[PDB]
Design an enzyme around this catalytic site. Structure first.
Site, PDB file in Angstrom:
ATOM      1  N   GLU A  26      36.389  51.781 -49.844  1.00  0.00           N
ATOM      2  CA  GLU A  26      35.348  51.856 -48.833  1.00  0.00           C
ATOM      3  C   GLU A  26      35.333  50.586 -47.994  1.00  0.00           C
ATOM      4  OE1 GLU A  26      31.742  52.174 -51.301  1.00  0.00           O
ATOM      5  OE2 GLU A  26      32.392  54.214 -51.790  1.00  0.00           O
ATOM      6  N   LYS A  49      34.086  47.287 -46.497  1.00  0.00           N
ATOM      7  CA  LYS A  49      33.222  46.202 -46.957  1.00  0.00           C
ATOM      8  C   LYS A  49      32.456  45.679 -45.750  1.00  0.00           C
ATOM      9  CE  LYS A  49      32.820  41.907 -49.409  1.00  0.00           C
ATOM     10  NZ  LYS A  49      31.797  41.136 -48.650  1.00  0.00           N
ATOM     11  N   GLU A  98      23.889  48.596 -47.579  1.00  0.00           N
ATOM     12  CA  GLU A  98      24.133  47.318 -46.917  1.00  0.00           C
ATOM     13  C   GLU A  98      23.490  47.374 -45.539  1.00  0.00           C
ATOM     14  OE1 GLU A  98      25.491  44.640 -48.172  1.00  0.00           O
ATOM     15  OE2 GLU A  98      26.611  43.495 -46.670  1.00  0.00           O
ATOM     16  N   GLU A 153      34.695  43.014 -43.325  1.00  0.00           N
ATOM     17  CA  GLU A 153      35.428  41.937 -43.984  1.00  0.00           C
ATOM     18  C   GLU A 153      36.699  42.453 -44.645  1.00  0.00           C
ATOM     19  OE1 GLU A 153      32.798  40.089 -46.727  1.00  0.00           O
ATOM     20  OE2 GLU A 153      31.152  39.853 -45.296  1.00  0.00           O
ATOM     21  N   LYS A 179      36.596  50.772 -56.094  1.00  0.00           N
ATOM     22  CA  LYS A 179      35.796  51.153 -57.249  1.00  0.00           C
ATOM     23  C   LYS A 179      36.368  52.419 -57.867  1.00  0.00           C
ATOM     24  CE  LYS A 179      32.067  50.350 -53.911  1.00  0.00           C
ATOM     25  NZ  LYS A 179      30.770  50.853 -53.385  1.00  0.00           N
ATOM     26  N   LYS A 230      36.945  43.606 -54.676  1.00  0.00           N
ATOM     27  CA  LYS A 230      36.862  43.348 -53.245  1.00  0.00           C
ATOM     28  C   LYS A 230      38.221  42.867 -52.755  1.00  0.00           C
ATOM     29  CE  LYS A 230      34.165  39.264 -54.535  1.00  0.00           C
ATOM     30  NZ  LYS A 230      33.201  38.239 -54.051  1.00  0.00           N
TER      31      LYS A 230
HETATM   32  O1  LIG Z   1      31.970  39.209 -51.322  1.00  0.00           O
HETATM   33  P1  LIG Z   1      30.713  39.740 -51.968  1.00  0.00           P
HETATM   34  O2  LIG Z   1      30.636  39.512 -53.459  1.00  0.00           O
HETATM   35  O3  LIG Z   1      29.449  39.408 -51.212  1.00  0.00           O
HETATM   36  O4  LIG Z   1      30.836  41.323 -51.842  1.00  0.00           O
HETATM   37  C1  LIG Z   1      29.897  42.181 -52.473  1.00  0.00           C
HETATM   38  C2  LIG Z   1      28.808  42.606 -51.519  1.00  0.00           C
HETATM   39  O5  LIG Z   1      29.391  43.263 -50.374  1.00  0.00           O
HETATM   40  C3  LIG Z   1      28.451  44.147 -49.808  1.00  0.00           C
HETATM   41  N1  LIG Z   1      29.121  45.429 -49.505  1.00  0.00           N
HETATM   42  C4  LIG Z   1      29.547  45.786 -48.279  1.00  0.00           C
HETATM   43  N2  LIG Z   1      30.122  47.014 -48.288  1.00  0.00           N
HETATM   44  C5  LIG Z   1      30.065  47.472 -49.550  1.00  0.00           C
HETATM   45  C6  LIG Z   1      30.493  48.706 -50.250  1.00  0.00           C
HETATM   46  N3  LIG Z   1      31.107  49.711 -49.581  1.00  0.00           N
HETATM   47  N4  LIG Z   1      30.249  48.795 -51.575  1.00  0.00           N
HETATM   48  C7  LIG Z   1      29.641  47.802 -52.248  1.00  0.00           C
HETATM   49  N5  LIG Z   1      29.228  46.658 -51.677  1.00  0.00           N
HETATM   50  C8  LIG Z   1      29.400  46.430 -50.351  1.00  0.00           C
HETATM   51  C9  LIG Z   1      27.283  44.299 -50.794  1.00  0.00           C
HETATM   52  O6  LIG Z   1      26.170  43.579 -50.286  1.00  0.00           O
HETATM   53  C10 LIG Z   1      27.826  43.632 -52.059  1.00  0.00           C
HETATM   54  O7  LIG Z   1      26.819  43.057 -52.874  1.00  0.00           O
END
Ligand SMILES: *OP(=O)(O)OC[C@H]1O[C@@H](n2cnc3c(N)ncnc32)[C@H](O)[C@@H]1O
EC number: 6.5.1.1
Length: 646
Positions: A306, A308, A361, A460, A465, A484
Site C-alpha cells: 500500500e 505510505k 492517515e 514516501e 503487510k 516500510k
Molecule cells: O516511518 P513510520 O514508522 O512513520 O511509518 C509508519 C506510519 O506511516 C503511516 N502510514 C502511511 N500510510 C500507511 C499505510 N498504508 N499503512 C500503515 N501506515 C501508514 C502511519 O501513520 C504509520 O504509523
DNA sequence: GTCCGACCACGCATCAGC
DNA sequence: GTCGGAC
C-alpha cells in the site's frame, strides 16, 4: 530498617524480609532510587527486569496502593497518555532550580551539566544549600509522584517560578542518590536502560511470583518454587503475554492496575478489553532495505503493498451512542483537532454500522487542484479549540485497517478479513475518505513500479503487510509486524549531500564526554559564504564518533570564521575550522524557518533544511569548496515530486 | 530480533521579560 | 522520524 542499604538485586530476594519499610507504610523514594541504582549498574535486560520485579514484589505485598506511583516513576510517566500531562520544565529551568537548591551559581552548574552530559550527577554531589537545615522528612514514592503531577498542573503567568519552588523542595529533601534520579526524571532522561517493555515484564513477573489480594504475612510469596527451570520460564512468559496484550488494547495503568490488584492477571483480559473511546497501541513498521529483504522475513507468505502516505496517523473511534473520538499514534486526544472529520463521519460509513475503530492517515488535502499537500502544510493546522469554519488546511483520510466493527474486536483476525470488512461497510469519497492505494502480487518488477508510482503520487514509499500468515493486530506478539519500504533506504537513491562541518555540540547521556551533534553547512558561491543547512546526530558508529571527536578537537576555534552564516540555528558549543566534509543522506528537503542555506533561491525569506539527516561517511578527497553548493540544494528542492506537483 | 536511548526538522502553544 | 549497541 534502613533504605540506604536496600538491595533489590540480592540473590534469593524475600519480598517481606529484604524490604526496607513496614507493611501499610508508604514506600520510601530511596528504595526506588536504590532500585534505579542497581538497574543502571547492569546492562543485561533480564537482570534489570528481575531487580525491578523484586521491588514490585515488595510493593504489592506490603503497600499495594503505592504500586501505581512506583510504576509511573519507573516509566518516567505522569499518567495515561490520553490525559496529556506535561511537566513544562526545560533544562534551563531545571538548572536554575539546581543552582538555587545547592547554593551555587547558575553558570557553574550549567558548565558542569554540559561537561558531564547529565544533570543528575550535578544535582546530587552538591550538598551546600543545606547550610544549617535539619533533614526534612524522608521522601516517599507517592509523594514524589504527586509533586511531579503538581508541577505538570501549574499553568499561566508566573507558573515557572512556582515549578522551581516545588523542584527546590524535592532537592533539599533528597538524600544519598535521590537527587540524581529526580533531576534525571524532570529532564526526561531517566537513563535506566529499562523502559515500557521491561516494566511490563517486571510487573507480570512480580504478580505471578507474589500474587496480589493476599493477607499479610503473605502465604504465597514465590509461586515458582516447586517448578523446573523450563517450567518456570514458560509460565512467566505466558503470564507476561496476558498483561502485554491487555496493555496493548488498554494502555492505561489507571485502568489496569486497580483491576489487576482485585482480580489478578488471569481475570484481566475479561475486565479490560479493546473498546471504542479508549485508545490502543498502534501497529508499527520495520524499515526494510529493499525489495529482496521483503521476500525474506515474510518468506512464502502472501502480502499486500500500500501507499505510505505522508501525514499524521488518525485512530478514529465511533462509540455506540454516536460520539466520535480521534487519537494520535501516541494515544493523545486529537478529537478537538479535527472538527471536519467529526462532521464528515456520516458520509464514510453505511447506516448498518454502529461502532468502529479505524486506522487511517490524515493527509493535508487541497480541494482547488485535487492534490495531496506535503507534511509541512499539515502541521500548520491548529491543535485545540478549533472552530469548524476556521479550518484553512483541509484533510483527506486514507484508511488502511479496521480494528473494531459493531461491538466486536477484530484484533485476532487476519488482515484479509479486516480489510474485507473495511471495503464492505465503508464508502469512499474522493478528497475526504479514500482507501489506501493497495496492490497484492509477488512480481518484483510490479512491486518496483508500485514504489515509483507512490513517490510520483506524493508518498514516501510503500507499506508491506502480510494477509494471512502472522497478519493479526496483536501488538504484544510483535510490535513491528509491518514493513516500510522507503526509497531513501536503498543504496543508490542519489539524495546524498556533501556538507561541511562548521560546529559541534557537547553530547549527553550515551554521548557524554564527546560530541553528540554537529552543524553542517553548504557553500554559497555567489556570497562566498558557508550557510548552515541542518544538524547531524545519527549515522555514526561509536568508534566513528570517537574518531570525529578526536580529529575535530584540533579545529576548535574561539570565534566563528567570518564567512560562516548560521542565522537562526542553535549556536554550536565548539566552533570548528571549516575543513571536514561529510556525505549525508536525507529523506526530503524542507523549507526552513531558521536555516539560511539557499535562502532566496526558492523562497524570498526562507532557506532549506534536510528531513531526517544521517551520517554516511567522510569525504577525504573533498575540500570545503568541493562540497554541495546552495544552488544544487535549491535545484534538489525544486525536483522533489511533491514540490513539482504544484 | 528485541529493546533502549542517543540524535534530526518543524510549528503551534505557552510564558518570561519588558 | 534514523540510527547503532548490548543482549
Ligand atoms: O516511518 P513510520 O514508522 O512513520 O511509518 C509508519 C506510519 O506511516 C503511516 N502510514 C502511511 N500510510 C500507511 C499505510 N498504508 N499503512 C500503515 N501506515 C501508514 C502511519 O501513520 C504509520 O504509523
Amino acid at each position: 530498617l534502613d533504605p540506604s542499604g536496600y538491595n533489590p538485586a540480592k540473590n534469593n530476594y524475600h519480598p517481606v524480609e529484604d524490604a526496607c519499610w513496614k507493611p501499610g507504610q508508604k514506600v520510601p523514594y530511596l528504595a526506588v532510587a536504590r532500585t534505579f541504582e542497581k538497574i543502571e549498574e547492569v546492562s543485561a535486560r533480564l537482570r534489570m527486569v528481575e531487580t525491578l520485579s523484586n521491588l514490585l514484589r515488595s510493593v504489592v505485598a506490603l503497600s499495594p496502593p503505592d504500586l501505581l506511583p512506583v510504576l509511573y516513576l519507573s516509566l518516567n510517566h505522569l499518567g495515561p497518555p490520553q490525559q496529556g500531562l506535561a511537566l513544562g520544565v526545560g533544562d534551563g529551568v531545571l538548572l536554575k532550580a539546581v543552582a538555587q537548591a545547592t547554593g551555587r551559581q547558575l553558570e557553574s552548574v550549567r558548565a558542569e551539566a554540559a561537561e558531564k552530559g547529565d544533570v543528575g550527577l550535578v544535582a546530587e554531589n552538591s550538598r551546600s544549600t543545606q547550610r544549617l537545615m535539619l533533614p526534612p522528612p524522608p521522601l516517599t514514592a507517592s509523594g514524589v509522584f504527586s509533586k511531579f503531577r503538581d508541577i505538570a498542573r501549574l499553568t499561566g503567568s508566573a507558573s515557572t517560578a512556582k515549578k522551581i519552588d516545588i523542584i527546590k523542595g524535592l532537592f533539599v529533601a533528597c538524600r544519598h542518590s535521590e537527587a540524581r534520579f529526580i533531576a534525571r526524571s524532570l529532564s526526561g532522561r531517566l537513563r535506566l536502560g529499562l523502559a515500557e517493555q521491561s516494566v511490563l515484564a517486571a510487573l507480570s513477573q512480580a504478580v505471578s511470583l507474589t500474587p496480589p489480594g493476599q493477607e499479610f504475612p503473605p502465604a504465597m510469596v514465590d509461586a515458582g518454587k516447586g517448578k523446573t527451570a523450563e517450567a518456570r520460564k514458560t509460565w512467566l512468559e505466558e503470564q507476561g503475554m496476558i498483561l502485554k496484550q491487555t496493555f496493548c488494547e488498554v494502555p492505561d495503568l489507571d485502568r489496569i492496575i486497580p483491576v489487576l490488584l482485585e482480580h489478578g492477571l488471569e481475570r484481566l483480559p475479561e475486565h479490560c478489553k479493546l473498546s471504542p473511546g479508549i485508545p490502543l497501541k498502534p501497529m508499527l513498521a520495520h524499515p526494510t532495505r529493499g525489495i529482496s529483504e521483503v521476500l525474506k522475513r515474510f518468506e512464502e507468505a502472501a502480502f499486500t503493498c500500500e501507499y505510505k502516505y505522508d501525514g499524521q496517523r488518525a485512530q478514529i473511534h465511533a462509540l455506540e451512542g454516536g460520539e466520535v473520538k480521534i487519537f494520535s499514534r501516541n494515544q493523545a486526544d486529537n478529537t478537538g483537532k479535527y472538527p471536519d472529520i467529526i462532521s464528515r463521519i456520516p458520509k464514510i460509513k453505511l447506516p448498518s454500522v454502529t461502532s468502529f475503530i479505524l486506522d487511517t492517515e490524515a493527509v493535508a488535502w487541497d480541494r482547488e487542484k485535487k492534490q495531496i499537500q506535503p507534511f509541512q502544510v499539515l502541521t500548520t493546522r491548529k491543535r485545540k479549540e478549533v472552530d469548524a469554519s476556521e479550518i484553512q488546511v483541509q484533510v483527506c483520510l486514507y484508511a488502511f485497517d479496521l480494528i473494531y466493527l459493531n461491538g466486536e474486536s477484530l484484533v485476532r483476525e487476519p488482515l484479509s478479513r479486516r480489510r474485507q470488512l473495511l471495503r464492505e461497510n465503508f464508502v469512499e469519497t474522493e478528497g475526504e475518505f479514500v482507501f489506501a492505494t493497495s496492490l497484492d502480487t509477488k512480481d518484483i518488477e510490479q512491486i518496483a513500479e508500485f514504489l515509483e508510482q507512490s513517490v510520483k503520487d506524493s508518498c514516501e514509499g510503500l507499506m508491506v503487510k502480510t494477509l494471512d500468515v502472522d497478519a493479526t493486530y496483536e501488538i504484544a506478539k510483535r510490535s513491528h509486524n509491518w514493513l516500510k519500504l522507503k526509497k531513501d533506504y536503498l543504496d543508490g537513491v542519489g539524495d546524498t549531500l556533501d556538507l561541511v562541518v562548521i560546529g559541534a555540540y557537547l553530547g549527553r547521556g550515551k554521548r557524554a564526554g564527546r560530541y553528540g551533534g554537529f552543524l553542517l553547512a553548504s557553500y554559497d558561491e555567489d556570497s562566498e559564504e558557508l550557510q548552515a543547512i541542518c544538524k547531524l546526530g545519527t549515522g555514526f558508529s561509536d568508534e566513528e564518533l570517537e574518531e570525529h571527536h578526536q580529529s575535530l578537537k584540533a579545529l576548535v576555534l574561539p570565534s566563528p570564521r567570518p564567512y560562516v552564516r548560521i542565522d537562526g540555528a542553535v549556536i554550536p558549543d565548539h566552533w570548528l575550522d571549516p575543513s571536514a566534509v561529510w556525505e549525508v543522506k536525507c529523506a526530503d528537503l524542507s523549507l526552513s524557518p531558521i536555516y539560511p542555506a539557499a535562502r532566496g533561491l526558492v523562497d524570498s525569506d526562507k532557506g532549506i533544511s534536510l528531513r531526517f539527516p544521517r551520517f554516511i561517511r567522510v569525504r577525504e578527497d573533498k575540500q570545503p569548496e568541493q562540497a554541495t553548493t546552495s544552488a544544487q540544494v535549491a535545484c534538489l528542492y525544486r525536483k522533489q515530486s511533491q514540490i513539482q506537483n504544484q
